[PDB]
Design a protein around this ligand. Structure first.
Ligand SMILES: *[C@@H]1O[C@H](CO)[C@@H](O[C@@H]2O[C@H](CO)[C@@H](O)[C@H](O)[C@H]2NC(C)=O)[C@H](O)[C@H]1NC(C)=O
Ligand SMILES: CC(=O)N[C@@H]1[C@@H](O)[C@H](O)[C@@H](CO)O[C@H]1O
Ligand SMILES: [Ca+2]
Ligand SMILES: [Cl-]
Ligand SMILES: [Cl-]
Ligand SMILES: [Cl-]
Lengths: 68, 578
């Protein structure tokens, strides 16, 4: 939902967050522990983002530059 | 729900096992008195012209503010015994307790009018009309925007309108961790098993963590300095960026969490991320409760009301209603009388810090760029400790930085926070001043003279009668802050009762109260009694000289300050598992 005070949108729980880009870096890190990447994919899966493509496209949809 | 558990839920669910929704987020407020609406179930008083309340016309909130609350800023009276940290903790605490959602502006696309822009009184708008000869808004066709709070029962048929509390009523540090499972996880660092909260990835504060950035397509913080492009922050409560002073307290508790989770890891290597997160969350939650009830509330209520409304704790009581009363959301706005018109920033010497050491509040609202680009949170926290709060006088209620210029950098027009409070109480159908006096067992004045006796101020009782006509119609906030302050307190008897009662229930009706048997061990409870807000500042900032307890009373440097080496650090030795 949307948190609104005096017409200002203070939070939108549907929007990709900036610090979640560091998670994308982990997934695309070849040497990164596989059990960690699997936990991140379950994190993103719980938000409707299943393929790496869905995750990147959501971050892009929400105003972030994707070059990965 | 769980036959037995150890940590509280994020939403507050099943804190009370006999009624698992009590205190849980996204539930209607509890009403200590039946709602009073113009038409009896939804319309606020002042909605329909010519419709009186108790035989008198409804007073324009903006007019009451102009004639009662307005005073010359420069004549402000400093509080000789309250720091500006006293005000700020009240705001942060309130953001642990209540948040009343409003409809988003974009819902007006194919429906109704845009309350941001239009002055048409149409759902969901309830704009404040401009009185004649207004000192700032000289166009009476204008208005101050106002969205009605969302109803607890959408639409509905003959259901007394009520409002929703999006937060957990419990004092559980939900302004850090959130009040819903998705946000709570979004706030957490899910790339390892350390149980940390997510921190900013683009900026630090002298090597120390900053809050992560929130993502808002129409971010208000970007408007405060277009070249800086610093958006608002993300925290357990969505208002974290309203003020850099507030932001600094959020940032402080975020660091404290990651500091605790770090130590607990070294202490118990076998614990996984979830375990570390929950244990550090439980300590922080107890720290907030301790600071609130041990240090803060005694200075709000004063000794007399403290002993009366918050007697010595006994044990948990599952018959206590721990919800936030609808009236508390407005009554706890007394803190607005404490607000100074500037943000004070000091250096390591507690001297004014350049660039700007005395910034008017009308240029700090949503100014997240100031935290990131103008020296972090250390200069802010130092100003909060070594600056006196504003004292509340019956002819110096609230400054004009919030009465004339609230959010003017992100709004088509400056807002009037005192007026918003009174309009808000009407939006929530709250009873008038005498209705709450009675509820609290206090005398109810009918005439200017009797009101003069209650207020010990014949002049103010006169201006209130001229605006409202009868003391029965005085909006609860206006009447609450108009009363003389109790001995060694900063609220009158009426607000001491409402505020005192609320926090009693939040203590006695909280199964996870830090002193309740089973929550912590004996060695852990004795360890937590040693914590203090000045020590938390020492542990998570570059500041090495901090206020001496009570931090909310200490407010002058170097008289009321000590070196960080003198205070004891929290001993987590009892958190060791064999
Ligand atoms: C908005 O932010 C800009 C950019 O940060 C401010 O200009 C800076 O002022 C700081 C003072 O701490 C200096 O250290 C920098 O050299 C300045 N940066 C630039 C880009 O010149 C600017 O002052 C702010 N706007 C206002 C109104 O204060
Ligand atoms: C054991 C105990 O304290 N029980 C009390 C009860 O006496 C009181 O009537 C009720 C109303 O608050 O709250 C509970
Ligand atoms: Ca809470
Ligand atoms: Cl109520
Ligand atoms: Cl909260
Ligand atoms: Cl007061």
């Amino acid at each position: 939902k949307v948190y609104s005070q005096n017409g200002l949108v203070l939070h939108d729980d549907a929007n990709f967050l900036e610090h979640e880009l560091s998670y994308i870096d982990v997934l695309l890190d070849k040497n990164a522990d596989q059990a960690t990447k699997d936990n991140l994919r379950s994190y993103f899966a719980d938000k409707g983002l299943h393929s790496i493509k869905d995750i990147i496209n959501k971050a892009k949809q929400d105003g972030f530059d994707v070059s990965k | 729900c769980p036959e037995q558990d150890k940590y509280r839920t994020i939403t507050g669910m099943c804190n009370n096992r006999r009624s698992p929704t009590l205190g849980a987020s996204n539930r209607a407020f509890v009403r200590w008195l039946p709602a009073e609406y113009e038409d009896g179930f939804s319309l606020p008083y002042g909605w329909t012209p010519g419709v009186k309340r108790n035989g008198f016309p409804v007073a324009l909130a903006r007019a009451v503010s102009n004639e009662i609350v307005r005073f010359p800023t420069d004549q402000l009276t400093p509080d000789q015994e309250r720091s500006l940290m006293f005000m700020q903790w009240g705001q942060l605490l309130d953001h642990d307790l209540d948040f009343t959602p409003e409809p988003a502006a974009r819902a007006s696309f194919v429906t109704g009018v845009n309350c941001e822009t239009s002055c048409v009184q149409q759902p969901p708008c309830f704009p404040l009309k401009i009185p004649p000869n207004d000192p700032r808004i000289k166009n009476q066709a204008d208005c101050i925007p106002f969205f009605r709070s969302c109803p607890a029962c959408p639409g509905s048929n003959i259901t007394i309108r009520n409002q929703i509390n999006a937060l957990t009523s419990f004092v559980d540090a939900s302004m850090v961790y959130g009040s819903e499972e998705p946000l709570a996880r979004n706030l957490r660092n899910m790339s390892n098993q350390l149980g940390l909260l997510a921190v900013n990835q683009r900026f630090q504060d002298n090597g120390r963590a900053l809050l992560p950035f929130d993502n808002l397509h129409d971010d208000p913080c970007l408007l405060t300095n277009r070249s800086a492009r610093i958006p608002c922050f993300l925290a357990g409560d969505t208002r974290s960026s309203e003020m850099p002073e507030l932001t600094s307290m959020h940032t402080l508790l975020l660091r404290e969490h990651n500091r605790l989770a770090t130590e607990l890891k070294s202490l118990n290597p076998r614990w996984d991320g979830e375990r570390l997160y929950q244990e550090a969350r439980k300590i922080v939650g107890a720290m907030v409760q301790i600071i609130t009830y041990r240090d803060y509330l005694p200075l709000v209520l004063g000794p007399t009301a403290m002993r009366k409304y918050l007697p010595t704790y006994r044990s948990y009581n599952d018959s206590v209603d721990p919800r936030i009363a609808n009236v508390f959301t407005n009554a706890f706005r007394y803190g607005h009388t404490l607000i100074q018109p500037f943000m004070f920033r000091l250096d390591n010497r507690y001297q004014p810090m350049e660039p700007n050491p005395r910034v008017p509040l009308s240029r700090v609202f949503f100014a997240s760029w100031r935290v990131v680009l103008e020296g972090g949170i250390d200069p802010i926290l130092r100003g909060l400790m070594a600056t006196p709060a504003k004292l509340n006088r019956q002819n110096q209620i609230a400054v004009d930085e919030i009465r004339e210029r609230l959010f003017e950098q992100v709004m088509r027009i400056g807002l009037d926070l005192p007026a918003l409070n009174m309009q808000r109480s009407r939006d929530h159908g709250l009873p008038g001043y005498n209705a709450w006096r009675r509820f609290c067992g206090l005398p109810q004045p009918e005439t200017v003279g009797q009101l003069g006796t209650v207020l010990r101020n014949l002049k103010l009782a006169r201006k209130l009668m001229e605006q409202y006509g009868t003391p029965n119609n005085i909006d609860i906030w206006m009447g609450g802050v108009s009363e003389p302050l109790k001995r060694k307190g900063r609220v009158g008897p009426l607000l001491a009762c409402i505020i005192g009662t609320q926090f009693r229930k939040l203590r006695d009706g909280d199964r996870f109260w830090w002193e309740n048997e089973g929550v912590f061990s004996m060695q852990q409870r004795q360890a937590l009694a040693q914590i203090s807000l000045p020590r938390i500042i020492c542990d998570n900032t570059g500041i090495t000289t901090v206020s001496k307890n009570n931090i909310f009373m200490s407010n002058s440097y170097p008289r009321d300050f000590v070196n960080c080496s003198t205070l004891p650090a929290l001993n987590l030795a009892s958190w060791r598992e064999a």
